Amino acid sequence: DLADRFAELERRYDARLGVYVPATGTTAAIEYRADERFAFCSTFKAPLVAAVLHQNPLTHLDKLITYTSDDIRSISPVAQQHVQTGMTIGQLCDAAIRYSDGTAANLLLADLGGPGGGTAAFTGYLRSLGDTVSRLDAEEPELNRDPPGDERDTTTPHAIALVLQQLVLGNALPPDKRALLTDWMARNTTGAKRIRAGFPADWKVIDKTGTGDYGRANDIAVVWSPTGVPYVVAVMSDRAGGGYDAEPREALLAEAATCVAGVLA
Amino acid sequence: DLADRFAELERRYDARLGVYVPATGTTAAIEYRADERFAFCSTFKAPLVAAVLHQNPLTHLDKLITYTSDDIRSISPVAQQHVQTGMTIGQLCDAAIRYSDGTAANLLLADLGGPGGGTAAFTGYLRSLGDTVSRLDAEEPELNRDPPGDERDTTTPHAIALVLQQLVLGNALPPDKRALLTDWMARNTTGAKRIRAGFPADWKVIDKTGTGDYGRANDIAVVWSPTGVPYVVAVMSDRAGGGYDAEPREALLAEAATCVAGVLA
Amino acid sequence: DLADRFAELERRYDARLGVYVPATGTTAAIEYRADERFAFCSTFKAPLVAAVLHQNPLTHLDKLITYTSDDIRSISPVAQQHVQTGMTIGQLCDAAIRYSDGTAANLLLADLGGPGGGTAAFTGYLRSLGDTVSRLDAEEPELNRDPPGDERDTTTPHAIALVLQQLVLGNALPPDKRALLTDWMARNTTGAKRIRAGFPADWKVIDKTGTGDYGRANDIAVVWSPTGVPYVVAVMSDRAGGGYDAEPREALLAEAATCVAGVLA
Amino acid sequence: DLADRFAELERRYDARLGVYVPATGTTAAIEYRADERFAFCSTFKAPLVAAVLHQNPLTHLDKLITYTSDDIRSISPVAQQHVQTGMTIGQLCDAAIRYSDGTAANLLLADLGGPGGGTAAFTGYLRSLGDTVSRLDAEEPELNRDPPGDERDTTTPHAIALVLQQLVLGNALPPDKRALLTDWMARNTTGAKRIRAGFPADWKVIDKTGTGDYGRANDIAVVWSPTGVPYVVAVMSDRAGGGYDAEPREALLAEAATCVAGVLA
Numbered sequence A, B, C, D: 001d002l003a004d005r006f007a008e009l010e011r012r013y014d015a016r017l018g019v020y021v022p023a024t025g026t027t028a029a030i031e032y033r034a035d036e037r038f039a040f041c042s043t044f045k046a047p048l049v050a051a052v053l054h055q056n057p058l059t060h061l062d063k064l065i066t067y068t069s070d071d072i073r074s075i076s077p078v079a080q081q082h083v084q085t086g087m088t089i090g091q092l093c094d095a096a097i098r099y100s101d102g103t104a105a106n107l108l109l110a111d112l113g114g115p116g117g118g119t120a121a122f123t124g125y126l127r128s129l130g131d132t133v134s135r136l137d138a139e140e141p142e143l144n145r146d147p148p149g150d151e152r153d154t155t156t157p158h159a160i161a162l163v164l165q166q167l168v169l170g171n172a173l174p175p176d177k178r179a180l181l182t183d184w185m186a187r188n189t190t191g192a193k194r195i196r197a198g199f200p201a202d203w204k205v206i207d208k209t210g211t212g213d214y215g216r217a218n219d220i221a222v223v224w225s226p227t228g229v230p231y232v233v234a235v236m237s238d239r240a241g242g243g244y245d246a247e248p249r250e251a252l253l254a255e256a257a258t259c260v261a262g263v264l265a
């Protein structure tokens, strides 16, 4: 009867909603269109940062990347402030996660190197995690604009929830780097109205948002109950019936999250 | 399946849990032990203030009540500091609700007058509101200590939820007096870890708690969704099998509330 | 002033105000009528519990005292609830401090034993702390009623501040017992509108209030700066010019504390 | 003696501190570097909203402003989530004040119109209020980065306090519009550790913060005594000797506020 409530939310917001919460020892998985494809949008920036941490000896975080105003593409609140100074890899990681900085993500992808500006290597990083479904094909901002049904730049709530589970709660990264990724998501500034708005204040929430055209609004999160039990929540949505210009509905993700909180409480 | 989650909570906390949320236009009633009896404890102080407001002109709120050190027979955080100054009816209403002041409640009961020091007149007021179930039989502090199974000083989640619905959302009180009751409950200091802890921060919660021996912990609340839609939530619990000294589990009420929030989201 | 502002408070509230803050390494002492005598009222209950703790092994805390309703004099919110059960020394300590229970204080005095119902031995305990000025002569409730100028049941802001400094910050008690006394004062329920109201919330305040006739209102506190630096604050007041029923003005004490906070910041 | 206490705070925090509290009927002005220039940082957003409120009917708040990803050039916690939805003038006012949203302020400056993207018209509004000292020369984020000694984008504690006094306590705005400005500042999310942290909990505080490079940390507030007596408090600081990256010290502002509270108590 959770599917009835999610399909109810879909009706309310004229949206397609994807929800996945991996099973734990105590709780069964929650699955609503969990294996349908949804566009990454900025949610790839969290595993992208893990890709950078994984293949680099950490001192790489201090490597200074310079760029020009021609490189500033999509919402980049931090990169627009540093054309003159450049930004270290660490600052690009910090910016890409906490401010969803689009230029920072492109520079970090470029740092992965290879064809398609780093997107083949980023997909390849996902494969190293066991995710054979997801793919990144374009950079910011084009990766938000693929039409509905196009498999490029998509993940599934199932696939990305499992990816995030390994990155934050599992062993994808050494504890060294794991802590840096976790802290950046914990101090994310873009998620206040999504999964975080749907869980009671005394649950801890770390998350990475994603937003794009066709009313795409995602949030992937790790949440901790007041007793300290972790759950991974992937909530993805789009509103393709409204066309390219369809507006994201953040309240859909908050309400879907509150529904999830009630099953996990 | 909500009932299954409530039974799991009852198991987790060694508690008996009662939940009632009255039906609305869009939502069905939520009922768990909705018609079983649970001890009022201080939850009676919310309708008590309404009873005093109901039978008195607003100007009665300024009447100064004086009392003695002999009247301090229970936890009275506000009245204890005012034996020498006296206290206004308004301040007793404020104290009974916001600080659960025990002496304030006895003075308001006496202000109702009649047999049992006001206890008969308070019950009759509940009866006048359609509450055929509830009964107040003692004053503070005895009304918290009736043994399990004793019908005295008990209500049901169903009955107290319907009482509270009429007081805050219905027309039991004129708008001026209703606004005073709502404001006192809105500024309550005792409910932070109960229904308020289980609802997301962007839901508005006004409540009146109750706590007693036998692990008794209640919380009656009016909550507003972020869209401004009101619901009445009565959550009552005790741990009576664990004896007189059983500790209340506030976290039980917070978790029950999170379960309810997920169904109302 | 500083003395101009305290004397302005005396004008505003038509009161006599005594303030003492012992010198530290960083701050000079604060003194306003610091050596004039003011009535203890319930502030003696904090050193009384220290007297009881010092004289006895912790196991003494479990000793059960029984009493009758004839012993219940003065404001005794806890002892009124336990005539039939009796109370252990520990809960008598708890009640005397956190609820200013007058009956609990008389029983604890009796446990000190000796002439005057324990008041000579309690006085003697203060002398062991270096306080040669203060004296307890009567029990509850008579100790609140001495006329102005009468030296009985009086202390000075100077003497009691240094008494409390030794009990909480010094070594009058072994760390075991020091923690019990400190925890009781930290969880006091009667001081919300006195020294606690005058200090910013991120200053930690532990206190013991005192209230009596002739507008007597005292508060003795240990406060901790946000960086963790402790100060002892004694604020004592009376309004004897207005006679026996002069009302205490709690707001004088909150304001005096705010003045003290401003010099300690 | 207050100036001595401020000079010590300045020593302790390696900071330059400016404090102004306008005179009242009962209290003298408090002045510490009241006429030295400090950078506005985001404290200008409070009179900015006042300017928008003043030269437009209330219904203007419903006007929908759309903007692009290119407009996100500073920390914009609300506006970076509404590139696709737009934001009303009302929502931009809310955001500029409560979240210090940088894009929101730039969009509001554009709504003021005129040369320099609105910076001339906003300064002209300060002139109409009698502020001959303050000037805004740049938009977000440049106005936070001017070097020490540069007069651009600066105000004084004296000037900003007098502006804020007129806006909240005077008659610069009609009461309908005055209440919106007051309410936004009352619900500000950024000031918990500054003037609000330095005042006792029972003082009402509404404020607008500013933070920038060179250790700049400002807070302008209106505070109400427990008696309901209002004061305007401007506290500004920088640590400019420590360079561009010198860290702001919020505790300096809280301690300065505690000093002022002690004088106003």
Ligand SMILES: CO/N=C(\C(=O)N[C@@H]1C(=O)N2C(C(=O)O)=C(CSc3nc(=O)c(=O)[nH]n3C)CS[C@H]12)c1csc(N)n1
Pocket (backbone or CB within 6 Å): A098, A187, A188, A189, A190, D075, D077, D098, D099, D100, D189, D190
């Ligand atoms: C968790 O998100 N909540 C936010 C929010 O968006 N805050 C952001 C966050 O994490 N921020 C940070 C930073 O990155 O450290 C900062 C620092 S921004 C900055 N820091 C520098 O060191 C520097 O050299 N330049 N700049 C520009 C302040 S708030 C913003 C918020 C805004 S108002 C409010 N109550 N919360």
Ligand SMILES: CO/N=C(\C(=O)N[C@@H]1C(=O)N2C(C(=O)O)=C(CSc3nc(=O)c(=O)[nH]n3C)CS[C@H]12)c1csc(N)n1
Pocket (backbone or CB within 6 Å): B041, B042, B043, B074, B075, B099, B100, B102, B141, B142, B144, B145, B190, B191, B208, B209, B210, B211, B212, B213, B214
């Ligand atoms: C004879 O009465 N017995 C009482 C009693 O005084 N009951 C009253 C009642 O219903 N009250 C309420 C309230 O409004 O809930 C309360 C709960 S307020 C509270 N105090 C805390 O210290 C705390 O940590 N959390 N909370 C929530 C105070 S007792 C009074 C009692 C309380 S616990 C226990 N074992 N007995």
Ligand SMILES: CO/N=C(\C(=O)N[C@@H]1C(=O)N2C(C(=O)O)=C(CSc3nc(=O)c(=O)[nH]n3C)CS[C@H]12)c1csc(N)n1
Pocket (backbone or CB within 6 Å): B075, B077, B098, B099, B100, B189, B190, B213, C187, C188, C189
């Ligand atoms: C800091 O003080 N603030 C108070 C306040 O007065 N709280 C008190 C405090 O510490 N209390 C305690 C207790 O003694 O533990 C209790 C428990 S009283 C109690 N416990 C038992 O186990 C029992 O068998 N019987 N009884 C009667 C609850 S509130 C009161 C307060 C009132 S409303 C609110 N939010 N806080």
Ligand SMILES: CO/N=C(\C(=O)N[C@@H]1C(=O)N2C(C(=O)O)=C(CSc3nc(=O)c(=O)[nH]n3C)CS[C@H]12)c1csc(N)n1
Pocket (backbone or CB within 6 Å): D041, D042, D043, D074, D075, D099, D100, D102, D141, D142, D144, D145, D189, D190, D191, D208, D209, D210, D211, D212, D213, D214
């Ligand atoms: C180029 O601009 N540089 C800025 C800047 O954008 N300044 C703005 C300004 O005045 N702002 C304010 C505010 O309203 O006070 C703030 C302070 S609020 C805040 N910051 C935190 O880091 C945090 O954890 N919690 N909270 C509540 C955000 S930056 C913005 C900056 C911020 S810190 C720094 N070193 N530079």
